[PDB]
Design an enzyme around this catalytic site. Structure first.
Site, mmCIF file in Angstrom:
data_model
loop_
_atom_site.group_PDB
_atom_site.id
_atom_site.type_symbol
_atom_site.label_atom_id
_atom_site.label_comp_id
_atom_site.label_asym_id
_atom_site.label_seq_id
_atom_site.Cartn_x
_atom_site.Cartn_y
_atom_site.Cartn_z
ATOM 1 N N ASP A 147 0.999 36.891 9.127
ATOM 2 C CA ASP A 147 -0.038 36.895 10.147
ATOM 3 C C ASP A 147 -0.529 38.328 10.291
ATOM 4 O O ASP A 147 0.074 39.266 9.764
ATOM 5 C CB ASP A 147 0.476 36.327 11.475
ATOM 6 C CG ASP A 147 -0.645 35.841 12.379
ATOM 7 O OD1 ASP A 147 -1.610 36.600 12.595
ATOM 8 O OD2 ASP A 147 -0.568 34.692 12.864
ATOM 9 N N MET A 155 -0.325 25.214 13.500
ATOM 10 C CA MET A 155 -0.392 24.659 12.152
ATOM 11 C C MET A 155 0.458 25.471 11.180
ATOM 12 O O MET A 155 1.304 24.918 10.468
ATOM 13 C CB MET A 155 -1.846 24.603 11.678
ATOM 14 C CG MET A 155 -2.744 23.733 12.543
ATOM 15 S SD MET A 155 -2.273 21.993 12.518
ATOM 16 C CE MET A 155 -2.846 21.500 10.895
ATOM 17 N N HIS A 195 -4.606 19.367 3.917
ATOM 18 C CA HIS A 195 -4.885 19.141 5.330
ATOM 19 C C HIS A 195 -3.655 18.553 6.014
ATOM 20 O O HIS A 195 -3.207 17.455 5.664
ATOM 21 C CB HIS A 195 -6.089 18.213 5.494
ATOM 22 C CG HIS A 195 -6.545 18.055 6.911
ATOM 23 N ND1 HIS A 195 -7.015 16.860 7.412
ATOM 24 C CD2 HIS A 195 -6.610 18.942 7.932
ATOM 25 C CE1 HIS A 195 -7.344 17.016 8.682
ATOM 26 N NE2 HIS A 195 -7.109 18.270 9.022
ATOM 27 N N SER A 216 -10.143 21.388 8.284
ATOM 28 C CA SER A 216 -10.368 20.031 8.763
ATOM 29 C C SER A 216 -11.750 19.488 8.428
ATOM 30 O O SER A 216 -11.915 18.265 8.361
ATOM 31 C CB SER A 216 -10.163 19.962 10.281
ATOM 32 O OG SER A 216 -8.856 20.372 10.638
ATOM 33 N N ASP A 262 0.822 -1.207 0.000
ATOM 34 C CA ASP A 262 0.000 0.000 0.000
ATOM 35 C C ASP A 262 0.858 1.260 0.000
ATOM 36 O O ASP A 262 0.537 2.235 -0.689
ATOM 37 C CB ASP A 262 -0.947 -0.005 1.201
ATOM 38 C CG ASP A 262 -2.091 -0.990 1.039
ATOM 39 O OD1 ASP A 262 -2.165 -1.657 -0.015
ATOM 40 O OD2 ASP A 262 -2.921 -1.095 1.966
ATOM 41 N N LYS A 287 -11.971 32.782 5.694
ATOM 42 C CA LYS A 287 -11.112 32.255 4.640
ATOM 43 C C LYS A 287 -11.377 32.935 3.302
ATOM 44 O O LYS A 287 -10.457 33.075 2.489
ATOM 45 C CB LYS A 287 -11.304 30.744 4.515
ATOM 46 C CG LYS A 287 -10.666 29.930 5.634
ATOM 47 C CD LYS A 287 -11.185 28.499 5.628
ATOM 48 C CE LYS A 287 -10.239 27.548 6.348
ATOM 49 N NZ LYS A 287 -9.905 27.999 7.726
ATOM 50 N N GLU A 317 -11.084 28.282 11.548
ATOM 51 C CA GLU A 317 -12.047 27.458 10.819
ATOM 52 C C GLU A 317 -13.350 28.239 10.659
ATOM 53 O O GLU A 317 -14.317 28.074 11.407
ATOM 54 C CB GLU A 317 -12.268 26.135 11.541
ATOM 55 C CG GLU A 317 -12.985 25.069 10.723
ATOM 56 C CD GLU A 317 -12.046 24.277 9.826
ATOM 57 O OE1 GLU A 317 -10.907 24.736 9.587
ATOM 58 O OE2 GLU A 317 -12.447 23.187 9.365
ATOM 59 N N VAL A 335 -5.599 29.764 8.799
ATOM 60 C CA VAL A 335 -6.313 30.668 9.694
ATOM 61 C C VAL A 335 -7.421 29.886 10.389
ATOM 62 O O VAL A 335 -7.485 28.656 10.280
ATOM 63 C CB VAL A 335 -6.871 31.890 8.939
ATOM 64 C CG1 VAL A 335 -5.751 32.616 8.206
ATOM 65 C CG2 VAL A 335 -7.969 31.475 7.971
#
Ligand SMILES: O=S(=O)(O)c1ccc(Cl)cc1
Ligand SMILES: O=S(=O)(O)c1ccc(Cl)cc1
Ligand SMILES: O=S(=O)(O)c1ccc(Cl)cc1
Lengths: 727, 397, 396
Positions: A362, A343, A469, A448, A313, A426, A421, A419
């Site tokens: 940022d 992240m 992700h 996510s 695999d 976004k 969620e 940034v």
């Protein structure tokens, strides 16, 4: 009969005897790029060994070399994965024949040197260990080790027996065998696996024959004699009867059980047993014991689970099984990371470590600097422990450029957003940089749950918008989940696919569905534990069931990491994702437990209190009021029921993702579950777990279904198997 | 058919481990001294009627190997027909020797049998003989091997026995052992050990700390602190953490010692003019999970009561080996034992636990205490390693 | 004395030789576990909770054989944790003493069903590994006049007048009767072949046997300081000890184990077990420690006296072939007919795994009584130190 042959194949070894009588056995399997322990090799080494014995009078030494880039690595995995319990006789006689060849080459009465030009892994290192002297070329890519344990096997070609004779039971097991550690030639010589080094592959054979000449001059009697074939041999650290080792020896099975946390991995248990039982008897009897444990593992189901996931695999993934066909390579010159959280900071680190130039944006220069401090503190740990130089660490950090101006994203061709969620956030973050970056730039998002198709509407070049992700800690998690929105082009997939390999990570391609595959499946795992907590099961038994199932982190502990408030948001998002879609939702029993903890101000580690208690940041014991809140102890189901419930929930939800087209291959399902959410490696993946299920019912997919129905009767219809798993 | 009677039950003093008095004494010499004492008590005893000598020995190697019972028969000049056999059921070897001796008498195929045990732990420390469940990974990994000390901490963790609770019992044993010595209870049964010149080597149990205070027991550190903690909790998953409550002051002492018991039929005793001091009513064996290990006595004590048609209220004295403080407290909690019926003359925490001989020591201790109190029944039981248990009920005659 | 003790099963492993033996790679614990797994295979529905004890003889309880090998057997085989487990050591008769102790436990009425046997992997744990008091205490060794078992056997042959031909003649006889017993399939259902964790065969026959033994080959062997002088200091009327015993007329150093299931009539009927024999009587005796091997003569008389029987009443005699002179003396003293003594061979041909030999030669008679359809058999062994153990069984 008892011989160097087993029971038509091409020749693998070139023979060469010089004027001095030194025979050079050059392994060069014509059916592949790497010397591999297959039926062809065994028959080839058999002929060569028979010839070494026949012409013993005109042979002074032996050199074992390879014509490939690698010395010798691997075996016929297409064959060992098909070994059945009735084939245990053939498997035993095969490794016994292999070791009979090496034992004859070892007790030849003349020195044998291994000219290790490249990777000598497992069976390859087992050949060199049969030699009396090992010389390695200190070149890039070269590795040495016995990684049979990572495939559910053990070094059955004398690897366990010889490493114990060379280093003792404790060192050979902990350092070489138990984890199948691969060594660079520098560290290899350091611990005693290799005797001396050379700078290039051309110097090997001339140095190998020179050592043979000098050995026959200085050490005549001891020539061609291993330390354990001499009288007065003393095993390092002593034998099990030695009083020094016999005092700590009972702690070896218990310390091993502590590291595996009770997981059903039979390979390290077998390696430890074969190592100790081998040190109690002579070398020949020890290797025969090593064979019986090897035949035990290969016929087992777990070895097939791991050979399926960590060989076939994983190679199908690295070959490009999920990368679109036809698309070519596109370079990456400047990576722009929006956001500097754990992240965003990790993403900037793993990218700059690969040699990429990074711009870490940022909303404030203070925050972007704190994000780069993550990479500085990571290199400080890497400099204190001495795994990198002071100069390469300076070049790495210099490739990261913290900023707060969106004009510094000029010249960026690879955007990775990290940034918060939120969709409209976004949309704005991408809206003010999409015109500053290059026109071919990849507009990647690290979300996510939120579907990529919706986030892509915030940009104009939607065919370059894609989900990338990651998983925290980004510097250690090996998987990147690439989500394909219904506007994302196949070229965008390939560029993210190649970038994932470029930073040393394994990719899987997933079609855009809410929850994707990793977050959706790991939710069912966490939810089963919270359901068990609400049902009245002891919290300690829940965390034990997770650790003993093979999970890296117990479920309640992970539930504090993932933040329980986020879990409430996902449940609301999944409810209105089908309520506002024309139907009604089936609330999971865990939802009530999530809300009771939220009501009590215990949302997880971020809040400072969850299912555990946190002091000085470090976790410290389960919350004592937890047992009284959920009436813990009123329900005491079997531990294997708790273990199977968590494993089956993830296995069934994985099957749903394949049925819905979320995943395109089981290889992505297995490796994705193993490397993304920490599915137990002994299972071979949440999809392999179905075909490799072995319980009281039996082994196979039909055994899985029968067990899923047994759980469905006593615990809920969510364990009822899908139609695709039936006849 | 027949009945088994105890005619004599003696033992040596228990010399401590560090700088002990019995360290210079071979374990064979300890048993010979008890044989020479039994001769003094009955010089006209016909030793030909003695058909077997059964000794328990948990670490039967070194000075304790080669059938230490048979060597006790030859070195003491006993008749070569008197047998001699060593057995090992861990902490109950001393009592299993007595029980086996009685079962041989009841079968009618043995007349008069010597039984007891010996264990010079200062010369042959436990684990010296090796063992599969420790030094073989295949079976160690499978049986979930955990030392006895951690199972004791787990018992206290489950049952809710605090560090104060176990130390409060350790002081009780220290006090009641000093009272028994000062009261002269052990005078006739503890045979002092002497050298080949008759010089005194030891006459009292050295491991005793009679000036023990509850404040001093709290100063001690939990001595039993590999992955055995995690191995234990993998079996007992409902327990989060193990509260290590046991120290060297509330655990059994590591000492040297030996014990002997003379057992025979009423005809054999009447043939030799012996006065029976007690009668073996019944025996039983049963155990529990090997990880917690030390919960074996409770089913074995329940079984020996059901066999003799007796209950707890019929027993006047209970004697459980004080291997660990939490074991006895767990035992007292289950069977609801009265506090003044339990280890009335102290136990192993104060005087020591010479593995192979402890079963026969506490057995003789109950014989001497039933007669001193003029009581009727007594029950003896011990916890065992690996999860076993043995129990015996005696009746005074 | 009330409860009768019956033998329901009595199996054993093949005896693997010492040098390049097939059982050298097998831990002695695995030899016992194999026999436990066989008893389960023969009675799958047996409630193992009824089993109250597991008694194993072991003369060298050290190393792989330490830490109560019987208890490890219970726990490694997954038997009920209440089934106990105890190791005992009475030198050669440990295997039979474990059986007698089991039978005596059943007779006392305080135990229902007991496994009894022995284990001894002499290729891994050689004799003397456990040390001993009569070797590490020169004061004791000096007083007891210690003499190894071999020299005592030579002394017996010197006193009774058994020539080097006389002992090698019996050695040829045991080799012949053992090979005939194997060919006739007498051991077919009582010798459980040892297998590995993969089911592969390791050993299915007593590989110490030399069935092609000849009178000439035995006479070519050689017999295997101080001990001779020490023995003659006790037996002062003997001038010189004739060393007749060689490796071909003495017992074999092997690895092996045996298991016997002993229980009451209630225990067998409750579990549906067919009793194959019945323990009639046991006895322990001995003789001089220097001669060391004349112990089974007073032990056989005391067990016959206790059962109300004489030599004429016993159909089969089974004395352990520790040394050829020991058997010839035991035969001459009681006039045992030559067709009733070790009729299926013995330790000289098949081996002598110390702790297990007693339970092995016991199960050998349980099977031979049923084959000949005979009633009574007597099993006895000489012991080191000068002891003796005997047992009488009656077919059911
Ligand atoms: O000769 S075979 O048995 O086909 C065989 C060859 C190579 C491997 Cl790695 C396994 C088996
Ligand atoms: O019996 S086979 O399946 O061909 C087989 C033999 C040997 C090995 Cl190592 C693996 C497989
Ligand atoms: O040495 S390893 O790379 O672990 C390896 C060993 C055996 C096979 Cl069949 C494949 C790989």
């Amino acid at each position: 009969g008892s011989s160097h042959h087993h029971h038509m194949p091409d020749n693998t070894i070139q023979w060469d005897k010089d004027a001095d009588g030194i025979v050079t056995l050059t392994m060069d399997d014509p059916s592949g790029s790497t010397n591999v322990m297959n039926e062809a090799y065994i028959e080839s080494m058999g002929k060569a060994v028979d010839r070494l014995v026949a012409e013993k009078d005109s042979i002074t030494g032996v050199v074992v070399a390879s014509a490939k880039k690698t010395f010798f690595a691997g075996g016929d995995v297409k064959t060992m994965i098909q070994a059945r319990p009735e084939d245990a006789g053939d498997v035993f006689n095969t490794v016994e024949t292999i070791k009979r060849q090496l034992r004859t080459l070892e007790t030849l009465g003349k020195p044998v040197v291994a000219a290790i030009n490249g990777a000598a892994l497992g069976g390859g290192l087992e050949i060199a260990l049969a030699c009396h002297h090992r010389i390695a070329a200190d070149v890039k890519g070269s590795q040495l080790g016995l990684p049979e344990v990572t495939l559910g096997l053990l070094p059955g070609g004398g690897g366990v027996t010889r490493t114990v004779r060379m280093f003792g039971i404790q060192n050979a097991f902990v350092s070489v065998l138990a984890q199948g550690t691969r060594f660079k030639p520098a560290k290899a010589k350091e611990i005693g696996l290799v005797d001396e080094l050379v700078a290039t592959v051309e110097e090997l054979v001339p140095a190998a024959k020179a050592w043979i000449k000098e050995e026959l001059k200085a050490n005549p009697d001891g020539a061609g004699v291993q330390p354990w074939d001499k009288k007065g041999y003393k095993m390092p650290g002593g034998t099990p009867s030695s009083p020094g080792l016999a005092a700590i020896l009972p702690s070896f099975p218990s310390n091993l059980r502590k590291q595996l946390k009770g997981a059903p991995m039979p390979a390290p248990r077998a390696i430890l047993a074969a190592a100790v039982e081998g040190a109690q008897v002579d070398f020949d009897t020890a290797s025969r014991i090593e064979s019986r444990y090897f035949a035990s593992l290969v016929t087992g189901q777990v070895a097939k689970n791991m050979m399926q996931a960590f060989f076939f695999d994983l190679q199908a993934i690295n070959a490009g099984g999920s990368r679109p066909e036809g698309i070519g390579k596109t370079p990456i010159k400047r990576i722009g990371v929006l956001g500097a959280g754990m992240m965003g900071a990790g993403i900037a680190y793993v990218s700059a470590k690969a040699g990429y130039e990074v711009v870490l944006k940022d909303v404030s220069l203070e925050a972007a600097a704190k994000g780069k401090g993550y990479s500085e503190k990571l290199e400080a740990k890497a400099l204190e422990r001495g795994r990198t130089t002071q100069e390469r660490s300076d070049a790495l950090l210099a490739r990261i450029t913290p900023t707060a101006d969106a004009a510094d994203f000029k010249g960026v061709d690879f955007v990775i957003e990290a940034v918060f969620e939120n969709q409209e956030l976004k949309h704005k973050v991408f809206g003010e940089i999409e015109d500053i970056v290059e026109p071919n730039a990849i507009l990647g998002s690290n979300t996510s749950t939120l579907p990529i198709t919706g986030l892509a509407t915030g940009v104009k070049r939607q065919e370059d918008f894609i989900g990338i992700h990651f998983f925290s800690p980004v510097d250690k998690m090996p998987l990147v989940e690439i989500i394909k929105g219904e506007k994302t082009s196949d070229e965008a997939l390939a560029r993210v696919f190649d970038y994932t390999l470029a930073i040393g990570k394994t990719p899987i391609v997933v079609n855009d569905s809410r929850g994707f595959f990793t977050s959706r499946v790991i939710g069912t795992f966490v939810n089963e534990a919270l359901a068990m907590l609400g049902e009245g099961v002891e919290p300690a038994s829940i965390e034990q069931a997770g650790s003993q199932a093979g999970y890296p982190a117990p479920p309640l502990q992970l539930s504090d990491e993932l933040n329980l408030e986020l879990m409430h948001k996902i449940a609301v998002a999944t409810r209105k994702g089908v309520e506002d879609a024309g139907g009604t939702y089936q609330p999971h029993p865990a939802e009530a437990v999530v809300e009771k903890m939220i009501e009590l101000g215990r949302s997880g580690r971020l809040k400072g209190a969850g299912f555990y208690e946190y002091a000085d940041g470090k976790r410290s014991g389960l919350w004592p009021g937890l047992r009284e809140t959920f009436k813990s102890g009123s329900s005491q189901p079997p531990l294997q029921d708790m273990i199977d419930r968590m494993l089956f929930a993830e296995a069934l939800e994985t099957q749903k993702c394949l049925d819905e087209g979320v995943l395109t291959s089981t290889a992505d399902a297995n490796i994705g579950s193993i490397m993304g959410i920490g599915f137990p490696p002994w299972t071979g993946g949440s999809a392999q777990f179905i075909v490799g299920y072995s319980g009281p019912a039996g082994t196979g997919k039909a055994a899985f279904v029968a067990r899923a129905r047994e759980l469905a009767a006593a615990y809920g219809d969510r364990f009822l198997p899908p139609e695709s798993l039936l006849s | 058919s027949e009945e088994a009677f105890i005619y004599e039950a003696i033992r040596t003093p228990r010399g401590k481990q560090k700088n002990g008095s019995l360290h210079e004494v071979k374990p064979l010499s300890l048993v010979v001294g008890l044989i020479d004492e039994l001769r003094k008590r009955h010089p006209d005893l016909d030793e030909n009627l003695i058909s077997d000598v059964i000794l328990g020995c948990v670490s039967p190697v070194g000075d304790q190997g080669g059938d230490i019972a048979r060597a006790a028969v030859l070195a003491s000049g006993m008749p070569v027909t008197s047998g001699g056999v060593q057995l090992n059921r861990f902490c109950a070897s001393g009592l299993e020797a007595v029980n086996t001796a009685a079962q041989k008498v009841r079968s009618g195929w043995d007349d008069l049998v010597l039984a007891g045990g010996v264990e010079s732990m200062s010369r042959v420390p436990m684990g010296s003989d090796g063992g599969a469940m420790g030094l073989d990974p295949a079976t160690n990994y499978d049986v979930m091997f955990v030392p006895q000390s951690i199972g004791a901490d787990l018992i206290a963790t489950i049952e809710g026995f605090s560090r104060e609770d176990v130390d409060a019992y350790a002081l009780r044993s220290q006090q009641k052992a000093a009272e028994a010595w000062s009261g002269g209870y052990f005078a006739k049964s503890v045979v002092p050990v002497r050298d080949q010149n008759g010089l005194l080597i030891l006459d009292h149990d050295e491991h005793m700390r009679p000036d023990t205070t509850k404040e001093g027991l709290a100063k001690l550190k939990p001595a039993f602190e590999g992955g055995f903690d995690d191995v234990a909790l993998q079996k007992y998953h409902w327990v989060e953490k193990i509260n290590h409550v046991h120290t060297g002051g509330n655990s059994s002492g590591i000492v040297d010692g030996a014990a002997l018991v003379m057992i025979g039929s009423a005809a054999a005793g009447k043939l030799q003019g012996l006065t029976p001091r007690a009668r073996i009513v019944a025996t039983a064996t049963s155990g529990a999970d090997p990880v917690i290990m030390l919960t074996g006595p409770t089913p074995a004590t329940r079984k020996v009561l059901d066999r003799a048609g007796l209950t707890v209220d019929d027993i006047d004295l209970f004697e459980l080996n004080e291997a660990f403080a939490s074991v006895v407290l767990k035992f007292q909690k289950d069977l609801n034992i009265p506090d003044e019926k339990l280890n009335v003359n102290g136990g192993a925490i104060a005087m020591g636990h010479p593995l192979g001989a402890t079963g026969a020591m506490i057995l003789g201790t109950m014989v001497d205490e039933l007669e001193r109190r003029n009581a009727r029944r007594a029950l003896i039981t011990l916890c065992i390693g690996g999860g076993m248990g043995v129990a015996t009920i005696i009746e005074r005659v």
